[PDB]
Every structure is written in structure tokens, then in C-alpha cells.
Design a protein around this ligand. Sequence first.
Ligand SMILES: CN1CCN(C(=O)C[C@H](NC(=O)/C=C/c2cc(Cl)ccc2-n2cnnn2)c2nc(-c3ccc4[nH]c(=O)cc(O)c4c3)c(Cl)[nH]2)CC1
Length: 238
Amino acid sequence: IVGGTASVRGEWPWQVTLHTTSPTQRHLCGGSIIGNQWILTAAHCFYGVESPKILRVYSGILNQSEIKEDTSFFGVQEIIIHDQYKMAESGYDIALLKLETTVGYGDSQRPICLPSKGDRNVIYTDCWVTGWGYRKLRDKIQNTLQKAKIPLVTNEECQKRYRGHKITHKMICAGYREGGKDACKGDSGGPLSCKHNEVWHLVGITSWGEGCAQRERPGVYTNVVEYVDWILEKTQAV
Ligand SMILES: CN1CCN(C(=O)C[C@H](NC(=O)/C=C/c2cc(Cl)ccc2-n2cnnn2)c2nc(-c3ccc4[nH]c(=O)cc(O)c4c3)c(Cl)[nH]2)CC1
């Protein structure tokens, strides 16, 4: 997160840190708890990941330093990548992780509400991107979970900012015209959480951008409202 600020413990209880074990254990990406065994995240996070066995999901974490060999985690049973996914820049950058065990909800960890089909028309004014990613282009994984408030940008505006790319209605953009606050390397797969009628909704999933926080280069996020039926298909399968 560029131009962000330290989060406080329990501010984003749906946020998770996804670690890979190969070759050495490290933070890979963020994700969001959406159900008792479901983490929603970005598809591009698994490029090169051959098996779920090398993955560890940590919840209720403010600081990466809370993670050591004796820290409890959730094993991944299944990696579900959307069938249409090819690359972040082309869309369908969404994935689900089915956990080997059930998340016990509490004040440190709980789900974020998915957006409603009847809310695709509403305009969100209170949007935040969160993660442990770089604070600048050549930096490192941050210890403390960062937050940054960013304005949603219309698709028409985002399309002007990205000549040569096709910004679809399955993508949602966020950024200040002058730059300064954005997601960066290590933030992908994490949430763009928007507060509406005193309830937080998972509006976006960090996906891509041209550099970090550049002027007239807003962040591009998966438009979660457009994938609610896909999530229900995978999570409510008979
Ligand atoms: C092979 N395939 C490539 C794509 N991918 C990734 O995970 C890509 C992912 N990028 C992001 O997290 C966010 C991108 C982004 C999003 C928006 Cl909305 C706007 C602008 C953005 N950017 C524009 N330029 N940079 N960012 C990213 N994560 C890391 C990352 C993650 C964890 C890490 N842990 C460590 O301990 C040490 C690390 O060094 C380390 C690096 C890097 Cl590098 N890049 C999966 C793997």
C-alpha cells in the first residue's frame, strides 16, 4: 500500500495473508474471508503454484511478525481458479480457496458481506484498499497491515487512463487523478472494502495497475458484484 497508514488490530477482520512454503515460507498475496471455509482472492497469485499443499492461510493477523513456525494456520484443500482466467490484465482475475478446516468466527476474524445485485446501481463513497505490500515500487513486504482510502473511478474514466487495454464492466477502478494512494506488489488478492449503510461489502479484489500510485493510473480491481453467481456456484455446489 502506497501513501497508506498502519491499520489497528481488528479493523479488517476478513483480511488474510496467504503464504507459500516453496522454496521458503513467505507472504504471497492477500485474500478475504467470505464463508467458514472460503477465501476469495486473485487468480494471478497462483502462477507457478503446482499444488495447494504449499499454501498456508493466516487470519487474525495485524503484523507478519506474529507469524512463526508455531503460529496456527488454515491448510488449503482446493484452489478454484475461474475457467476464463488467462492473465490479470484480461480479467476474470478471481479465485477461491477451500480450506481444510472451518474458520471459527470472532472479533479477530469474520466474513465480509458480498455485494448485492440490487447494489450494482448504488455509489460507494467510503472505499479502502488494504495489504502488507510495498510502500514504493522497489521496497519490501511490510510488517503491519496498511490501509488507504481511495475514490472509486467510473469505467469510462478508467478506460481513458488505460489506452491499449480493454477495461470491462467486470473490472472496477480506484485512484486519485493525481496518484499518491494505491495498492502495490504484495497487496494483490486482497480486498477493496466499501462501507454502505453501516455494512462493509467486498466490492473489489486487488488485481493490477501500471506501476504503483502514479497520477492518472488508478488501480484495477475485479468487480466482485459481477462474480456473485460464480461464487455461489462454487460455494453452494450440491
Ligand atoms: C508469477 N506471478 C506474477 C504475478 N503475481 C503477483 O502476486 C503480483 C503481485 N502484485 C501485487 O500484489 C499488486 C499489484 C498492483 C495492484 C494494483 Cl490494484 C495496482 C498496482 C499494482 N502494481 C503495479 N506495479 N506493482 N504493483 C506481486 N506480489 C509480489 C510479492 C508478493 C509477496 C512477496 N513476499 C516476500 O516475502 C517478498 C517479495 O518480494 C514478495 C513480492 C510482487 Cl513482486 N508482485 C503472482 C506471481
